[PDB]
Every structure is written in C-alpha cells, then in structure tokens.
Fold this protein.
Amino acid sequence: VIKFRAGVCEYNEDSRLCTPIPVQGEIEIKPNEEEELGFWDFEWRPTEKPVGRELDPISLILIPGETMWVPIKSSKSGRIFALVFSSNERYFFWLQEKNSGNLPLNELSAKDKEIYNKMIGVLNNSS
C-alpha cells in the first residue's frame, strides 16, 4: 500500500553499531490483508542479499506499545530507521540512497519531520 525505498542495516544494537554496507531493497507497509490481528507488518523485500548481518527477509508485525520508535541510534552514521522489538527480534533499516538526506543528524532517518509523523501514526492504529 505504502511503498517507500529502503535497505537493510546491521542487526546489532548491543553496542549501538551502525555500518551501512551498500544494499538495495524495498519496505512495503500493508495493514495485513488477512487482518489477523490488524497489526502492521513491514515486509522487506530484497534486491541484494543481506551481508555482514544476522538479518534475513521477513514480514514482521508491529505490536502497539512494545515497539518503540527511536529516531536515531547511532551518531556515527545517520539515515537509520531504528525499530526496537521487545522479545520479537530487533530490526534496523537504512535509507539506501547516498545522494539524499545528507542533512545533519537531528530526527534524521532519511527525513526528519516526515518520518516522525509516519511512524507514530502507524503504531497507534490497528485497523
């Protein structure tokens, strides 16, 4: 339903590591056609395989209140969407573009204000 461009990024967040390894993909937000629990899976879809990371293609359902939104997790590298999953495997994502969002880090994850609205709005919803 909502397509936006993104790639995968490092699993680790024990020591808050972030290293972009150039990679390509898509995220697509669907409110689940099946509507099993209505919760909004982000299924990522590969164009280049993960590397250097535990991450794997999946369709991962987002639980209201047990998934927190963090705008930035690593000062070392920006453009990182941080999706922290309580006991359901964390996943981190990176804006694949390197010609976009070279804006200084603030609420940056690709874009500042735009992403901040999107993420919160989704967690609250259920339908």
Remarks:
- The chain is about 10% helix and 25% strand.
- The longest helix spans residues 113-124.
- Strands lie at 2-4, 7-9, 25-29, 42-46, 59-60, 67-70, 80-85, 91-94.
